[PDB]
Amino acid sequence: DNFMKDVLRLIEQYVSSHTHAMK
């Protein structure tokens, strides 16, 4: 159930690396 909270967390690490344009 709360397994994505860890990814959304891990994500800020991963998806934030492939993201240099967030306005």
Swiss-Prot record:
Q: Where in the cell is it found?
A: Secreted; Host membrane
- Top-rank taxon of the source lineage equals Bacteria
Q: What happens when the gene is disrupted?
A: The yopBD mutant can secrete YopH at the same level as the wild-type strain in vivo but is unable to translocate YopH into the cytosol of HeLa cells. Much less YopE and, to some extent YopH, are detected in cytosolic fractions of HeLa cell monolayers infected with null mutant. A mutant lacking the transmembrane region forms smaller pores with delayed kinetics.
Q: How does it assemble?
A: The core secretion machinery of the T3SS is composed of approximately 20 different proteins, including cytoplasmic components, a base, an export apparatus and a needle. This subunit is involved in the formation of a pore, called the translocon, in host membrane. Interacts with YopB/SctE. Together with YopB/SctE, forms a multimeric integral membrane complex. The C-terminal region interacts with LcrH.
Stated role: Component of the type III secretion system (T3SS), also called injectisome, which is used to inject bacterial effector proteins into eukaryotic host cells. YopB/SctE and YopD/SctB are inserted into the host membrane where they form a pore and allow the translocation of effector proteins into the cytosol of target cells. Essential for YopE, YopH and YopM translocation. Not required for IL-8 production and proinflammatory signaling response in host cells.
Tell me its family.
Belongs to the SctB/YopD family.
Q: What's the entry's take on its domains?
A: The first five codons form a minimal N-terminal secretion signal. The N-terminal region may also incorporate mechanisms of yopD/sctB translation control. An intact putative N-terminal coiled-coil might be critical for full virulence of Y.pseudotuberculosis. The central region (amino acids 150-227) plays a specific role in facilitating translocation of Yop proteins inside host cells that is genetically separable from its role in forming pores on host cell membranes.
What is this protein called in UniProt? Type 3 secretion system translocon protein SctB
Q: Which organism is it from?
A: Yersinia pseudotuberculosis serotype I (strain IP32953)
Q: Which gene encodes it?
A: sctB
